[PDB]
Amino acid sequence: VEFDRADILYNIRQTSRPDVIPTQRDRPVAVSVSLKFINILEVNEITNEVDVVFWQQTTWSDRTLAWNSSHSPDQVSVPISSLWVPDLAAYNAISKPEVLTPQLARVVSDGEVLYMPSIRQRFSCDVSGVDTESGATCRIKIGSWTHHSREISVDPTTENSDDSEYFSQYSRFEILDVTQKKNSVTYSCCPEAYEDVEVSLNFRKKG
Amino acid sequence: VEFDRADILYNIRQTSRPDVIPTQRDRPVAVSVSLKFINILEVNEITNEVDVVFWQQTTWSDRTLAWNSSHSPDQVSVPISSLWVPDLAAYNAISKPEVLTPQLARVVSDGEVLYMPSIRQRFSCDVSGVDTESGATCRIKIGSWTHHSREISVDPTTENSDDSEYFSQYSRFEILDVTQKKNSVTYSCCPEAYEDVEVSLNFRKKG
Amino acid sequence: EFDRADILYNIRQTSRPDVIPTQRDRPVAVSVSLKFINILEVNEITNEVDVVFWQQTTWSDRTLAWNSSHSPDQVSVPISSLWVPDLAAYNAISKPEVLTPQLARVVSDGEVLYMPSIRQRFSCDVSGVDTESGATCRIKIGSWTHHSREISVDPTTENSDDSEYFSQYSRFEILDVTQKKNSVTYSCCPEAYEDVEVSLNFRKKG
Amino acid sequence: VEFDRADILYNIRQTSRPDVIPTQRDRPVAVSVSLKFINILEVNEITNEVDVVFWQQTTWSDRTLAWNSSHSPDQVSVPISSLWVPDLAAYNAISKPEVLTPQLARVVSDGEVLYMPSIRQRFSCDVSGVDTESGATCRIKIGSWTHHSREISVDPTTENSDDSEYFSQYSRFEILDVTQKKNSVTYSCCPEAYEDVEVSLNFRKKG
Amino acid sequence: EFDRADILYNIRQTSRPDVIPTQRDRPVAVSVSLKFINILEVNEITNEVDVVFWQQTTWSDRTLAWNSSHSPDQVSVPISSLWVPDLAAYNAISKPEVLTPQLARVVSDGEVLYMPSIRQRFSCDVSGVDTESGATCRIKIGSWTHHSREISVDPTTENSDDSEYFSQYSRFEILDVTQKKNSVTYSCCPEAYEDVEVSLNFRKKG
Ligand SMILES: *[C@@H]1O[C@H](CO)[C@@H](O)[C@H](O)[C@H]1NC(C)=O
Ligand SMILES: *[C@@H]1O[C@H](CO)[C@@H](O)[C@H](O)[C@H]1NC(C)=O
Ligand SMILES: *[C@@H]1O[C@H](CO)[C@@H](O)[C@H](O)[C@H]1NC(C)=O
Ligand SMILES: *[C@@H]1O[C@H](CO)[C@@H](O)[C@H](O)[C@H]1NC(C)=O
Ligand SMILES: *[C@@H]1O[C@H](CO)[C@@H](O)[C@H](O)[C@H]1NC(C)=O
Ligand SMILES: [N+]
Ligand SMILES: [N+]
């Protein structure tokens, strides 16, 4: 054992610059974002508002975190306060994200970071048809609040898992389909393009 | 690269004095304030209260932040906790501003600062006529809480985009017009003048 | 001589926020004035009000003073860098929700002005709220832990309209705001605690 | 003046160890606990829940705080963050204590500490009979969460003042009697005894 | 030899709260036991419960140990000075509201006993709550970020009654509480994560 977990964590806390985006060769930090829906708690077809629980699965690389793990543990759990974390925000959120879980990320000796908080949050989106067979399709847009496409690129995750694997069987609602579209948007507010992942939650009230 | 992003951020955090208004020449800090409405969530015509979501687009100059970017990135995102930010408050707010987004501002190498939080907040204003064709006109006044007109001037941005560019299509309400104008008010409390931007939100319930 | 950065640096390095600025063993004179902005919710059954007010607080702290003959004579300072009086409303039934930036204004002679906008609920007399005479809700504000030899609490000068800053859009209207200074000795402690009692006479609009 | 208030507070701030229980001679710290009821805000006889405002009058001795006051002030107010405070909890509380008042205690030059926060808190207790002449009797148990009887002893106080001395005349309810009594309980979780003060609030809806 | 001041000073100076106390590359054995205190609100339509429980948590951290042959063998330490397991209820729909002082008990051999009283809301099976058989609500608690080689989670051996500490004033009553140990592999992740599944069998009182 070259570096034990105490040495690894000590090195990360002393030298991780949480305010510094881990950019490489002036390429954007590639952030992967995938929502795994856990619950749909409250739906209002009149106001077009949903209250939803989801895992915001977030991965990226930060090579300033890397260590030689040939004779050491190759992974540690790190408080996010000690790490740079992408400034992701859901564009159509109408409440502050309530993080339900310990605020720790997993860091791998090659600098990959995985962070997957469970968030409860309310959204403004299309709720029409929720009580039909076709269901409603609520779209959630997540992207960097302040980093444009040359600094943060945002891409949807890789595909092997079912959409309902994590979803509560006790919810009043059921998931029909979940698709993760990718957008690069240039707005009037700002000259640069901002990338987002658009998650389409097709869901319906159980019969 | 002369200064990479780590160097820029290091220099800012070591020398930015967040308590210190960046007044130059004994001229006021010119603060630009523009509200971009995102949603109108709840309206009560009996109590004259609205619950609204808006981007509080705030720009100002802080020369102590400037760096030589001839061979360096000319922009970085910085936690507002490392910067002086204007002490702006909505005068007719009846709840604490709920900041929905990451608390980062964008700083340009010439010292210009761009801070645009998405805020949910409740306001006491005129809701009468909300369910008519003319609609209601809700006025929100935003100014510095403690800096008078010789220290902070407050001005509405030049208005280029439509008032609904970022407004939710799923809101029960629609925006008819938004106008911004500045005031300089002497109050009886204090002998100086305090500047504000008055935002008039003309809106109505959809038919 | 001193720019704002120097003044704020000096204050931040030498202001002792835990230390009451008593001088000659006289009480710190704290002026308290409530300016009502809104009355949000009223319940005549439970005798509870929800209100928005500016808690205008002034006092002197000479350890803050600087020579301003060739310098700015005022700066805004985070209250975290300043001693602030431990004032509490005796009949509050919620924590004070401070709506505004936590900054005070400090003048070069050491006079501090702190005026947070606060939303807070109170237990008080709501009876008669829907009559012409209105209800009279009394709010008592005093130092939680400093007795009259350490903090004296005085109502400021009433100079303006009592509805000067009151919302025209409130369901309610203000008939009169009066501010008075009581001097009480309670069964807890052989010494005296000062408070300002604010009487808010208000009614539902017709 | 030998030590002014600045010197006293400086000395306390520098040497008070707020994480260290002030045992002497391996005797328990004697903590006095007395509730003074200010208001009864909400009562539910169906759920057996009450919402109450009370002063939690707490006194104890901490000799590491003492100073020579022969020529100095014999009392100061001190942020509780600079003092050790007893880890008291109400056993049947169903909400976190909402502390309404500034978080300062009073310290006397002999090391006697008095801390009296005004607390709003909800309780699970017997609400039956609330709307009868006999009234309801709601019992609240307060003791140390983690210190057993050899480390903290908890005792009530003396009935100098009436039970409704500070109780709101504007409450929907009235206090008939308060009794505060000492308990020492050995539970099954833990081989030690934990002391508590059990406050019995006899109260009724006004007629 | 060491008074409580010395013990706490040594812990505060050397306890590394971000460092998991793995030994010989064996997992930290974390014991988890829920003691239900109250069931506050139940909704059979939404399948949601609001519950108060003691989250009794124990583990060993030998970097906390001290020689207690002539010293106190136990102290209470703020959790902020200790490593605590990153436990999370998988079906919680609200943040855990910790009702109690955030202190743990540390024994001189390095055993930590942390038992917060927690109010939390859960999504689980509420059907049958108003029948004699009652509802069975299952709550799963495991480490959020540590797999089975780093943290093992096990139900504690508990002689004490299910209702030992449950409120007699609750609208509900407890019929049975079982605890059960799982280990799962999810698609997201190569490794296995351990949890304790607590089955709360409960019903509305008649
Ligand atoms: C990693 O460390 C080991 C020494 O334990 C060494 O064998 C190897 O060279 C290192 N790999 C590098 C430097 O990439
Ligand atoms: C910026 O730096 C360059 C060298 O990188 C220098 O030539 C130029 O004078 C600098 N700008 C200033 C100090 O105005
Ligand atoms: C303030 O500074 C001025 C100018 O330097 C000086 O005349 C005066 O002595 C100072 N005030 C005092 C302490 O008398
Ligand atoms: C307290 O201080 C006075 C002198 O200021 C001294 O006479 C007395 O001895 C001191 N108390 C003791 C015994 O520590
Ligand atoms: C604890 O101290 C005692 C003597 O006070 C000693 O016998 C022993 O070496 C110490 N710790 C161990 C290794 O058990
Ligand atoms: N999980
Ligand atoms: N995870």
DSSP string, chain A: --S-HHHHHHHHHHH--TTS---BTTBPEEEEEEEEEEEEEEEETTTTEEEEEEEEEEEEE-GGG----TTS-SEEEEEGGGS----EEETTB-S--EE-S--EEEEETTSEEEE--EEEEEEE---TTTTSSS-EEEEEEEEESS--TTTEEEEEPP--S-TTSSS-TTSSEEEEEEEEEEEEEE-TT-SSEEEEEEEEEEEEE--
DSSP state of D155: E
Q: Show Cβ contacts of residue B92 under 8 Å, excluding neighbours closer than 6 positions.
A: B123, B124, B125, B139, B140, B141, C167
Please give the C-alpha separations between residue A195 and each of A35, A155, A183, B114, B117, in angstroms, as whole numbers. 16, 8, 6, 19, 18
Q: Is E50 left (phi over 0), alpha (psi -120 to 50) or beta?
A: beta
- How far is A26 from D153, CA to CA, in rounded Å? 64
Q: Decide if D53 touches C, using CB distance below 8 A.
A: yes
- Tokens 């052989």 locate to C190
State the Cα–Cα distance between residues B17 and B85, nearest whole angstrom. Answer: 10
Residues of A in contact with E16 (CB under 8 A): 6, 9-10
Q: What number of helices (H) and strands (E) belong to chain E?
A: 1, 12
Say if CB D167 and CB D178 are below 8 A apart. no
Distance E186 CA to ligand 6 centre (A): 9
Cβ atoms of residues D28 and D150 within 8 Å: yes
Give the tokens for residue E152: 């093992």
Report yes or no: B46 at the C interface, CB cutoff 8 Å.
Answer: yes
B129: chain C residues, CB-CB within 8 Å: none
What distance in Å separates the CA atoms of residue C75 and residue C89, rounded to the nearest whole number?
28
CATH top-level class of C1-206:
mainly beta
How far apart are the C-alpha atoms of A29 and B37, rounded to whole Å? 30
State the Cα–Cα distance between residues C111 and C104, nearest whole angstrom. Answer: 10
Q: How far is CA C44 from the centre of its chain?
A: 26
Asked if E142 and E20 touch (Cβ cutoff 8 Å), the reply is: no
How far is D120 from C33, CA to CA, in rounded Å? 25
Contacts of C156 (CB under 8 A, 6+ apart): C31, C32, C33, C56, C58, C179
Contact between chains at A146 and B172 (C-beta distance less than 8 A)? no
Burial of C12 (0-12, 13-18, 19+ CB in 10 A): middle
Q: Label residues D48-66 b or e (16+ Cβ within 10 Å = b).
A: bbbbbbbbbbbbbbbeebe
Closest residue of B to A47, CA-based?
Answer: B172
* Ligand 2 mutation pick, B7, B63, B68, B109, max ligand atoms within 8 A of CB: B68
Experimental approach taken? X-ray
Closest Cα in chain A to B36: A189
Q: Which residue of D has its CA nearest to E100?
A: D89
Neighbours of C34 (CB within 10 A): 21
Q: How far is CA A52 from CA A118, A144, D126, in A?
A: 10, 21, 36
Tell me how far apart the alpha carbons of residues D50 and A25 are, in angstroms, rounded to a whole number. 62
Torsion of CA C16, C19, C20, C26, to 10 degrees: -110
CB contact under 8 A, E117 and D48: no
Cα distances from E163 to residues A24, A91, E33, E62, in angstroms, run 58, 46, 14, 34
Q: Which helix (H) or strand (E) segment is E97 a member of? A: strand E97-98
Using an 8 Å CB-CB cutoff, list chain C residues near D41. Answer: 46, 48, 93, 123
Q: What single string gives the DSSP state of each residue in chain C?
A: ---HHHHHHHHHHH--TTS---BTTBPEEEEEEEEEEEEEEEETTTTEEEEEEEEEEEEE-GGG----TTS-SEEEEEGGGS----EEETTB-S--EE-S--EEEEETTSEEEE--EEEEEEE---TTTTSSS-EEEEEEEEESS--TTTEEEEE----S-TTSSS-TTSSEEEEEEEEEEEEEE-SS-SSEEEEEEEEEEEEE--
D57: left (phi over 0), alpha (psi -120 to 50) or beta: beta
φ/ψ of D14, rounded to 5, equals -75, -25
Q: Is E64 exposed, middle or buried (0-12, 13-18, 19+ CB in 10 A)?
A: buried
φ, ψ for residue D112 (rounded to 5)? -75, 125
**Contact indicator for E5, E129 with CB cutoff of 8 Å:** no
E108 CA to middle of ligand 5, Å? 13
Distance CA C61, CA C21 (A): 6
Reported CATH class of domain B1-207? mainly beta
CB atoms within 10 A of CB B66: 14
- Which of B77, B95, B107, B172 to mutate: most A Cβ within 10 Å? B77
Nearest to B23 among C4, C52, C98 (CB): C4
Give the bridge partners for C75, in sequence order: C106
Torsion of CA A63, A67, A68, A71, to 10 degrees: -140
The helix/strand/coil state of B134 is: coil
Cα C99 to Cα C96: distance, rounded to the nearest angstrom:
9
Separation of alpha carbons E28 and E63, rounded Å:
13
Burial of B27 (C-beta count, 10 Å sphere; 0-12/13-18/19+): exposed
> Token pair of B204, please?
């109505």
Nearest to C31 by CA among C206, C196, C145, C204: C196
How many Å from the N-terminal Cα to the C-terminal Cα in chain D?
57
Alpha helices in chain B (DSSP H): 5-15
Q: How many CB atoms lie within 10 A of CB C97?
A: 15
The answer to whether residues C4 and C72 touch, using CB atoms and an 8 Å cutoff, is yes
List of chain A residues whose C-beta atoms are within 8 Å of the C-beta of residue E95: 98-100
Beta bridge partners of A136: A203
Query: Which amino acid does the sequence have at A91?
Result: Y
Retrieve residue D201's tokens: 């609030």
Give the Cα separation of A176 and A159 in Å (integer): 17
- Beta strands at B136-144 and B193-205: parallel, antiparallel or unpaired: antiparallel
